[PDB]
Design a protein around this ligand. Sequence first.
Ligand SMILES: [Mg+2]
Length: 207
Amino acid sequence: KGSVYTAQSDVQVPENESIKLTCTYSGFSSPRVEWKFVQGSTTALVCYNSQITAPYADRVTFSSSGITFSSVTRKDNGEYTCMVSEEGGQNYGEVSIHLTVLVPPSKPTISVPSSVTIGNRAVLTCSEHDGSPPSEYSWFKDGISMLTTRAFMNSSFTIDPKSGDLIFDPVTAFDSGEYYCQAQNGYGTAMRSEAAHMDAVELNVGG
Ligand SMILES: [Mg+2]
């Protein structure tokens, strides 16, 4: 019959740069090429009847071998599906391409409670929302990297690299110290946050 394929189904490209989403096909004579963009629940047509649609006409150019973006932004992340059909609908084929627009992580912020009551729970947060793909996190206490393997077994802590949560349950006097974190996503350079000190006392905090 007729096949439809792509050179790269997982495309990564820095923000603001040009990129061509390729879609090759063979076995067609009078093909109708269409493209759709899926992000979450939103479904938009980029190309209809071999023609770039209105909302994309200002930066997307059509060609029989794929669509070229003169520039992409983080808002373009998602999957693009190239749909090729022989005029009449007898022969059909399609191929999906996931686009990831690269953006290095921004300086993350941290939430470290100045005072916590020993025996209770304490969650220190670390995050940034600009990185693409999403950043992973790591923590430090008084300059020591908490995981390299734990920096010390003397604490009942847990760290979730994906959310960035540093969890102390229960918190002990030993957990008192200066903490800061860093975010990285394999692109650009890792960024560190500001440091913050946490004091662990014996009685209830907050009066
Ligand atoms: Mg913002």
